[PDB]
Structure formats: C-alpha cells, structure tokens
Amino acid sequence: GVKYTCGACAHNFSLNKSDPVRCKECGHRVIYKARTKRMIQFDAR
C-alpha cells in the first residue's frame, strides 16, 4: 500500500510484503518510503 519510491526510476510502487524488492525497470534494489499523509508542523524560529 505504501508508495515505496524507487531509487532509480522514481516509480511509486507498493509491495504486498511478498515481492522481492527491486526496480521494475532496471533491477535497482533500493527503495525508500515516501512522505506521510499527515501534515508536518514547524515553528519557524
């Protein structure tokens, strides 16, 4: 469900806790999570 951002081709792909974790375009195996649905806050000082 999570947009696991690809490390190479920027593809937003979710994985079902079962997929071997790579780029679908070049085999690049590095993903990262993307930012939340929440809104971040800061006090700007």
């Binding site: 469900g1 999570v2 696991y4 806790k17 071997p20 974790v21 085999g27 195996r29 590095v30 993903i31 990262y32 999570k33 993307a34 930012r35 939340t36 929440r38 971040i40 806050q41 000082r45």
Partner: protein, 1161 residues
C-alpha cells in the same frame, strides 16, 4: 626574471596541489600493491610438492608421484555483488554504503597443477581483496563529474580509505623502526653491559623481519675487567663470543680479523682495547670447531653428529644471520666486512669519538602504509592458503580422486581474515589476537571536512605506553616540514602522534638494481679488491643497508647522480644523499621515507644563478598557461631540475635560508617589521636550499590558524586539536549518504582572516563556522575566566544553528532453514516483552513513515522473531535514543548481504546553540556560552553595531595570545575595505599597515570605539576594542553530558549500578572522593554512600562456625548450619553485595573468612 615574490610561490603550490590533490600516500602505494605486490607474493613461493613414493605395502612400486601445483597470474576487476538471486552486477560505492556491503573485488587465480612422472582448477575466486575508494582499480578513478553526480560521488571528495562491512575504515601509517642501519646505543648503568651495536634485519623484496643480531659490550665503567665483547645471535639461547663467531663465519686467524676490522695501526687506544678480545678468544682456533661450539648452544640437536650439527650451524650462518644482505653464500667478505664496520663503529662510540646515536633523528625511521600492510597480511593468509591446499591434497590422494580444485578452495579464508583484520584492526590472524599491534585501522571520522583531511594523513607510534620516557615524546628537531609542530592531541597520545605535513610525500619502493647499475656505471670498485691498508681513504657506499663497494671521489659522482635526479634517469623520489665526514655515501630507496621538497638554490659558482633561486618567471608563466610552449604540470617541475626532494637523512647535509628575500644579503631601525638573523659567519655561503614557504611547515589542521607565529605554542597545539571538532560541511552529498554521525552547520562563512593555504583544503569553499563580532570587554562578570556573552537576537537570526543527522541499522537473522525473522508491527498479545514505550508510530510494515514527528523512547524498527518451538513471538525492537527528538527524513529499506531484508533509518533534528554549548576561538581562548543577552542589552558602538561574542580581558594577558588581537584588527579592516586579507604567516604584513589603513578609512587607529552601556548609555569610561573574527563550533554540547540517576539498571554479576551514559549508569564515587570524606571525617555520609545508594545486601551467619552457610527459608522461617547442626546461634548482617562476592570467591578458593560479632582477644 625578477624577484620571486610570495604569490609566485603560491603559483608553485597551485601546481603541486593540482597534481596530487591530497592523499597521494594512500592511492599511489595502493596502486603499487595492486599492480605488483600480489603478483610477486604469489610468485614468491609458487610451488608445493607432495609425494607418496614407495612401499604403499607395495610390490616395491617405487614411483615418484610428485604432486606439483604452480600458482600463476592473478585476475583483477571491478567489485561484484553476486545476489542471493545469483545475478552479478556492477556494485558501486553508493550501493556499497547503503547496503552494509564490502566494496570487494573478485581476485582470481589460475593453478598450474603438474605431475612428475619420474619413477624410481581454473579461475577460482581465491578471495575478496577490498578495493579502496578513488583508486586505479576502483571504478571511480575516471568518469566525468557530471556522471559522478549521476553516481553520487562529490568532486571535492578525495577518497584514500577502504570500505568494510559497509562502514569506512582508514589506514594509519604505522611507524616501524628502520631496518639494516648500523646503530650504536649506550646502555643504562646498573648492569655490566654499557655499549651496544644493534640491527634489525628485513629482506629487500618483501620488507619482512627475519633476524636481530645484537652486540653487548661486557664491561661497565671500570667494572668487568676483561673489556671484551660477545655476540648474541638469532636461534641461540645464550651469548657467544665475538672472535668465535668471526671464525665461525669463515675468518679464523687473528691477523685477518684485525685486517677486516681495524683501519688504523696507529689507533693504539682502540687497538689497546682490542687485544683482550683476541686473548680471550684463543681457545677456539679454527673454523669447524667454532661451528661445533655454536652447535652446542644454538639448537643443533643433541646426538646429531658433528657433520649435521655443523650443517645446522652453517644454516644459521647461511640463512638466519645477516639475511637481508644476502641469503646465498660466497660473500663472507660482504658479511664479515659488514661486521667489521660494526666492530669499527662500536669501538668508535665506546671511546666516545662521537655522541651516542639517538632514537628519534627522523631519518633513522621509516613508515608503513597500506602497501606494506597488505603485503604482510596477504603474505600471512597466503601461507595459510598454502597449507590448506596441502591438507586437502593429502586427503584426496590417499583415496586417489581427480580433484577439480573448485571444492578445494573454501575461499572464506582470506576474505574472512582481511574482513576481520580491518574490522577491528587487531592486526593478525584472529588466533593471534593478543601479542599483536592493536588498533591499526580506524573508523574514519566525518564530523567536519578538515577533520577528515587530517585524519587521512595521520601516523601513530608503537612504543606502546610502557615507558614514560620524554625522549621519544620530544619535538625532535629533524621535524622541519615533515610533521606538525602544532598538532598532537592532548594527553596520552602526546609526543607520539605525528600528522604528515602539508609537504609530506610517501616514497614508494623502487628497483634498487638500476641504482646499483648507476653505481658500477662509473667505476665503483667491488668489495673483494678491498684492503683498507691499501686504501684507507676510499668512500664506502650504502644501498639501503648493504655496503657494496668503495670509491675515491664522491663529488663528481654526486654531481652526476644528483643531476640525474634533476633530470630523471632515477626515480625522482629516491634520496641520493652525500656525506663527506665518514668517507661514506648512502642511497636509500627504502619504502616509507618521509620526503619533502625545497626550492633548488643554485648552490654552484658556475653562473650567475648562484645564490639565486633556479625557478624563473618563465616557468611561472608556463604554469599559468597550463602547458609548455611546445601537458606541463608539477611532474615536469620535478623532472625539470627546479625542485629536489629530501628526506630526513639529507636534512643532515643541507643549508637553508627561510625566505627568498634572504638569499640576497639585504639592506633602518623600523619598529614594525621582523628581524631575520644576519648570517655573517660564512662570508661566502653556499646555500643549497631555500624554503618554498614557511607556512608549509605546518600540518593540515595547523595551516588553518590565522597567524600561528604570534602565540604561546600550547595554544597552537590546542587550536589544531580543536579544529577537527568544527561543525560544518563534511561532504556535499549528505542527501544520499547514511552515516551514524553527521552535522551540517547552517551558514558557513569563509573567514576574513583566510590564509593563502586554505585554498588547498577548500575551506573557503566549505567552511565550518562564522564571523561573529568580538568585543573583548568585561561587562557584567559573566566572562570571568573564559565564559562568554552571546546576543540571543543574533542566534534568532540564525547564528550557528545546527543540523543533526544520525543513521540507525537492523537486519534479519535466520534461526532455521524454515525459521527466519520478520519486521512487523507486534501485537499486545502474541508477542513477549513489549518495550515500555508505545508502538503507535509504527506502520503496517514495521518501519515508521517519514514526515512523522518522533520522540525518544518509542519504536522505529520492530524486529519480531517468533520463538522457535500462545505467546510465541519475541519483541526485539530497535528504538530511538532516550535523549532525542526529531522528524524523520529518508527511511531506507533493502536486502542484505544475506538475502533477507535490511534496514537503515536517517532521523534528524536541529539543535539551537544555547547556554553551555562550547565554542572556540581560533587561538584557543575557549569556553562555553556563559549567558544570553537580548539585543538591546548589549553594549553598542556609535553606529549601532552590537556584538555577539565577548571573550574576557582576563582571558588574554597570561595566555599571551597576541595573534588573536591581530586577527580581530585585520578582520575589521578587511571587512571595511571589503576583501580578504592575506594572513598567511611570516610575511611583511606588520601591524603598522593595518593601523594606518583603519585610521585612513575614517576610524581609530588601534581598534577602539566609544561604546556604551545598554542600560544607560552613560558612556563606557574606557574605549572598548571591537570587531569581527572567525568562530567555530566544537562538537560537544550540554545536551549530551547532562545525566542524573535515581536508580535503575544494575548488573547481574555484582549488583552495583551500571557503567556508561548510554544505559543511564551511575557515577564512580571513587577512591580519592572517599579520601576526602575521611579527611572531613563524617563517616556516616560514607556509610550512606557505600551501603545505601548501592548494592545493599543482607546475609546470615551461624554464630559458631562463623560462616554464611545458613540456608534461609523465610515463609517457613527455618534455618540450619548444616556443618554444625546449629539452629539457634544465628544472626543476619548488612554488608555490600560485592563484599559477599569476595566471601564466596574466597571460600571457593579455600580461605575461610569467619565473622564473629564480638571482640575476643
């Protein structure tokens, strides 16, 4: 031409530091390793031989089945990550660092297995040698800075260091004693042995220790009547007389030993000390009886008869003594004439025709970098490979199988060895853990950029710490331009740790054989035509430790050879070095000599260049074109004859003036400038060398300092050992890198007191601090002793506000073939021992989504293992630290080396520079932010300028750091005229030019402006000195060292509270605290401390046998001293649990402490 000015030397430095960059010393010698060393370590001992020859319960089948493997060529490539999938692809240092990898290449090797039939198994991956960054044999030597941003490598990176199990490790240039030099040390007095002539042997190829012949003069000062000497040998057990081992090496009569040794039949004093040595060695008269004699002490075996006893003695005198000279025979003249130089020398020093030699005269040492270290450890595990193949061969020849060799290399051997031995650096086979030179390789430090720039250069010294001696810790005066007279840490390291200077280069290791050809190329005469009575005045010539011949005139030869290094027939880093005093002349080619460059002064009255520098301005225009007028870099300077290299041995035989205005003898009484000496001793000098620039004597963390030449030198050392703790910009790719420490300083300014040298550490393009406003004036007692004042509104504007990064880690383990781990969100039911934080911030997949505010004490990485065979899972979460807050950045998720999952998380927050945060001058005037004032409450000068940092008047007058004032003044001027003033030291920049310019741009001459109270405006009676200055931020804060503790974690072993900050331990109310409690005497406080806030513990004693054996059941309330049948004479006590531990330990050693509770007598 004209005057070579200062900036012409900065042209010279731009050419040098555009050729090499910085870390030549790693890269070029590691290239030497990968190009030649493994090829020759393999082809050192290329063949093994088995044989199962005859009487195999045979039919007399006498068959030399000789099993012969010959090792061949190595195969070299890029690193390769074979997946758990099995696919192989080009690994890259980003993909290395993200994935805990080992940037390691295939090292292949073919094997020539042959069979003797004299009757009477392909490219195996034999190991993974890890590849350094930025090498020739890394894939990032080449390839296009554009694509390096496409490949995540910063151009202002430089590499030099290795990658192991992910993280970055480095090689300290370890510092060994020099080999094969003919030393004399004198021995301490409570002993019968006074003078010593010592050596340490090591083979020319290979650079490996074999022998250590020692000489001990029997005789204290008028004690030890027979003033004769014995030898000590390798593989003996006892001292052996000198003339006997001479007759053992093959020179029997007295006349030829005195002909070999003695050079003056009129030196009757030394000849007089000679005579008892022969008169004592009379009882062993010829060769083989001395061979038999040394057979009796030195491991020639008992009952092994004369011919094989003497064989073995011929082996310790064939191999195993003087091995580095040669290991073939026939040159007993070479061996004995070496030892005759030794006897010559030790008798020179025992009559004190000389000083003793000294330990630290820095030409008499060498250095070991990655080249020689990989040579040694590769040699070791390569021998281990040898015997592993040998082991498998003697199993698959008994059953006689055609072995394919590819199940005969379990290549976890050398990969596992090198991986551990750079992992912790406990240097050796792990089953040689102790007795090993510990701490070779280190965590590379990435706290700021200059810190790494020094730390990649650092050398360390193995005296150990046994011996508090201040002779090896002295700044001994060979150090001119080779190490750093400023930088060395505070404390235990001091005097040892030597940072290679900003003109250091590491000499590689070179074929000595053509140098030999250069020697015999001019009629050097051989050693067998040598009679010192025929030639007393010939010059005896060394090549790295072998005397090879004699010659009459060294001067024409050193002209020719020195000009051939000025041309390039030699390696231009080989130190051809002359002496005239000894009638000797050495050529080192040795590995690990610390050399340095100098401007070649035309030392020769042949033309008008004499006295002048050979460097012309035409060469300067050539360097400013980038080419010669039909590539022209620093290499062509080296091979032009304008700059020659010297190491510490040629530093003996030179003559330097410091700056090129001192070469011509100059033209007064001005009270601004500095006073060079006259040098009116030699009316007609022959200067041979002049310094390129004096601020090139510094270390890398030393050239940063504005005007080091106006301070008290412990503050120079302090500033150099604080410059490494700056907060700043460490490498420009902190977006993709995941490291456990990283900190970005927000607003980094190049200092207005820049140098000319900070171009070559890039610090003006990556600085690590700011210019804030200095105002040295006691204001309200808050800067009394080294605290300071900081204006809070300036922080609110962003002053030094600090980014904070941290990378965590976790991975999956495998507890069975069908039993693995799983990072999931654990329940409150199925899982054991939930952490006492919450779990809410976790996601569906166990790793928290970024953007989410995080506190300490709550999870990020919940590693749940089901317990191998409800309530069957283990909660083994990896939490965020108990001190931190933050908002999360870039949550990596991938697959490990193992094939399972892998995680890394890079949390971040931002720390406000607040009260207690340490700061630092650039002259050590350090301290903490004492107090924060808002904007209006500052003092403020006539225009509205307020200050931000107020160091103390009382911080100055004893610390005597007048350079700090000079920096503040030069800062204010270069601010107003708007440019960065050259504060590189040792110029004619006085204080007078700065004074006149500040006045003539409309100000006071000596800095002051009439500043005010902020609470009245009633003018401050004295005028206040006031300006900008460059500041930095040291790595400590107060939020990392505050800690207090009520109770909590106690150890199982001793029940005394635990040690360390990280587990919230407790403090050590140590010995001398108890001492001062005794001095005050209020011991009731002491009975609070060592009973009640600690391991308060309650035991019982039977009152008859006095022991604590009494078994304690309490809800049934019964007791029995079972050695006594005692049931009534029972007391309890109140003792420390460690005291009880003492009692149980002692009774388990059979001593019986018995505690009777009454005085007896």
């Amino acid at each position: 031409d004209d005057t070579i000015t200062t900036e012409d030397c900065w042209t010279v430095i731009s050419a040098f530091f555009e050729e090499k960059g910085l870390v030549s010393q790693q890269l070029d010698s590691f290239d030497e390793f990968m190009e030649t060393s493994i090829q020759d370590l393999v082809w050192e001992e290329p063949r093994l031989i088995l044989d199962q020859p005859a009487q195999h319960t045979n039919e007399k089948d006498n068959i030399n089945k000789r099993y012969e493997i010959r090792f061949g060529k190595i195969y070299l490539s890029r690193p390769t990550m074979t997946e758990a999938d099995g696919t192989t692809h080009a690994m890259f240092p980003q993909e290395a660092r993200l994935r805990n990898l080992t940037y390691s290449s295939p090292v292949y090797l073919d094997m020539e297995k042959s069979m003797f039939t004299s009757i009477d198994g392909n490219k195996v991956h034999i190991g993974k040698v890890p590849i350094m960054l930025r090498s020739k044999f890394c894939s990032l030597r080449t390839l296009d800075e554009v694509d390096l941003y496409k490949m995540k490598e910063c151009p202002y990176d430089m590499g030099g260091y290795f990658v192991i199990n992910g993280s970055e490790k480095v090689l300290i240039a370890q510092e060994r004693s020099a080999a094969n030099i003919v030393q004399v040390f004198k021995k301490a007095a409570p002993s019968p042995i006074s003078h010593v002539a010592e050596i340490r042997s090591a083979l020319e190829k290979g650079s490996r220790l074999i022998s250590t012949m020692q000489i001990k003069l029997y005789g204290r000062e008028d004690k030890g009547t027979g003033r004769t000497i014995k030898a000590t040998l390798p593989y003996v057990k006892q001292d052996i007389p000198i003339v006997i081992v001479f007759r053992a090496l093959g020179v029997v009569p007295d006349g030829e030993i005195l002909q070999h040794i003695c050079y003056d039949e009129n030196d009757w004093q030394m000849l007089e000390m000679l005579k008892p040595c022969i008169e004592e060695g009379f009882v062993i008269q010829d060769k083989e009886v001395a061979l038999d004699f040394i057979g009796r002490r030195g491991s020639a075996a008992l009952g092994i008869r004369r011919e094989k006893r003497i064989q073995y003695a011929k082996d310790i005198l064939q191999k195993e003594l003087l091995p580095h000279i040669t290991q073939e025979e026939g040159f007993e003249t070479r061996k004995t004439f070496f030892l005759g130089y030794m006897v010559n020398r030790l008798l020179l020093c025992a009559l004190e025709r000389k000083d003793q030699d000294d330990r630290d005269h820095f030409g008499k040492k060498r250095l070991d970098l990655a080249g020689p270290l990989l040579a040694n450890l590769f040699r070791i595990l390569f021998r281990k490979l040898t015997r592993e193949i040998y082991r498998y061969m003697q199993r698959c020849i008994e059953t006689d199988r055609d072995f394919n060799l590819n199940l005969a290399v379990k290549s976890t051997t050398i990969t596992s060895g090198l991986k551990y031995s750079l992992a912790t650096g406990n240097w050796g086979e792990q089953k040689k853990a102790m007795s090993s030179r510990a701490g070779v390789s280190q965590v590379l430090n990435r706290y700021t950029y200059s810190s790494t720039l020094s730390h990649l250069r650092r050398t360390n010294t193995p005296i150990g710490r046994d011996g508090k001696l201040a002779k090896p810790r002295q700044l001994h005066n060979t150090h001119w331009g080779l190490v750093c007279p400023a930088e060395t840490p505070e404390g235990q390291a001091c005097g040892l740790v030597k940072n290679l200077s900003l003109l250091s280069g590491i000499s590689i290791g070179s074929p000595s054989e053509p140098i030999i050809n250069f020697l015999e190329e001019w009629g050097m005469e051989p050693l067998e035509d040598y009679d010192p009575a025929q030639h007393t005045k010939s010059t005896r010539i060394f090549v790295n430790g072998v005397w090879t011949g004699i010659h009459r005139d060294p001067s024409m030869l050193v002209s020719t050879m020195r000009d051939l290094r000025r041309s390039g027939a030699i390696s231009p880093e080989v130190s051809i070095i002359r002496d005239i005093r000894e009638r000797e002349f050495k050529i080192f080619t040795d590995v690990g000599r610390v050399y340095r460059p100098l401007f070649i002064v035309e030392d020769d009255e042949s033309k008008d260049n004499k006295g002048e520098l050979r460097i012309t301005k035409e060469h300067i225009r050539k360097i400013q074109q980038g080419y010669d007028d039909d590539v022209y870099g620093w290499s062509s300077l080296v091979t032009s004859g304008v700059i020659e290299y010297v190491d510490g041995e040629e530093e003996e035989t030179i003559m330097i003036a410091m700056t090129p205005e001192d070469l011509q003898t100059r033209s007064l009484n001005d009270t601004a400038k500095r006073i060079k000496p006259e040098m009116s001793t030699s009316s007609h000098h022959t200067f041979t060398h002049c310094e390129i620039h004096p601020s090139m004597i510094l270390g890398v963390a030393a050239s940063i300092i504005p005007f080091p030449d106006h301070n008290q030198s412990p503050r120079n050392t302090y500033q150099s050992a604080m410059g490494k703790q700056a907060m700043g910009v460490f490498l420009t790719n902190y977006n993709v890198r995941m490291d456990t420490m990283a900190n970005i300083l927000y607003y980094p300014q190049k200092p207005l007191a820049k140098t000319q040298a900070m171009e070559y550490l890039k610090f003006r393009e990556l600085p690590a601090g700011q210019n804030a406003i200095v105002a040295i004036a006691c204001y309200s007692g808050y800067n009394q002793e080294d605290s300071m004042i900081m204006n809070q509104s300036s922080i609110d504007r962003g002053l030094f506000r600090s980014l904070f990064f941290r990378s965590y880690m976790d991975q999956e383990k495998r507890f069975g073939i069908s039993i693995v781990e799983e990072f999931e969100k654990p329940t409150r039911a199925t899982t054991l021992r939930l952490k006492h934080g919450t779990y809410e911030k976790l996601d569906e997949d166990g790793l928290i989504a970024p953007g989410v505010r995080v506190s300490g004490d709550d999870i990020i990485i919940g590693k749940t293992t089901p317990i191998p065979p409800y309530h069957t899972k283990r909660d083994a979460s990896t939490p965020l630290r108990s001190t931190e807050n933050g908002i999360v950045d870039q949550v990596l998720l991938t697959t490990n080396q193992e094939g399972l999952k892998f995680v890394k998380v890079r949390m971040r927050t931002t720390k406000v520079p607040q009260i207690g945060d340490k700061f630092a001058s650039r002259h050590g005037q350090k301290g903490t932010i004492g107090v924060t004032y808002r904007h209006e409450d500052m003092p403020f000068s006539a225009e509205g300028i307020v200050p931000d940092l107020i160091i103390n008047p009382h911080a100055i007058p004893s610390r005597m750091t007048v350079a700090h004032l000079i920096e503040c003044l030069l800062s204010k001027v270069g601010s107003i005229r708007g440019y960065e003033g050259d504060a590189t030291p040792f110029t004619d920049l006085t204080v007078d030019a700065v004074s006149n310019l500040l006045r003539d741009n409309g100000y006071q001459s000596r800095g002051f402006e009439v500043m005010y109270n902020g609470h009245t405006g009633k003018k401050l009676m004295a005028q206040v000195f006031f300006g900008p200055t460059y500041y930095q931020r040291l790595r400590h804060m107060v939020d990392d060292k505050i800690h207090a503790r009520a109770r909590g974690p106690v150890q199982v072993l001793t029940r005394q509270p635990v040690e360390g900050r990280s587990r919230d331990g407790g403090l050590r109310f140590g010995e001398m605290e108890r001492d001062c409690m005794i001095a005050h005497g209020a011991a009731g406080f002491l009975k609070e401390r060592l009973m009640e806030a600690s391991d308060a513990f309650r035991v019982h004693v039977c009152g008859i046998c006095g022991l604590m054996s009494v078994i304690a059941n309490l809800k049934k309330n019964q007791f029995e001293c079972r050695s006594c049948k005692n049931k009534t004479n029972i007391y309890q006590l109140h003792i420390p649990y460690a005291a009880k531990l003492l009692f149980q330990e002692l009774m388990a050693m059979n001593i019986a402490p018995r505690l009777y509770t009454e005085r007896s007598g």
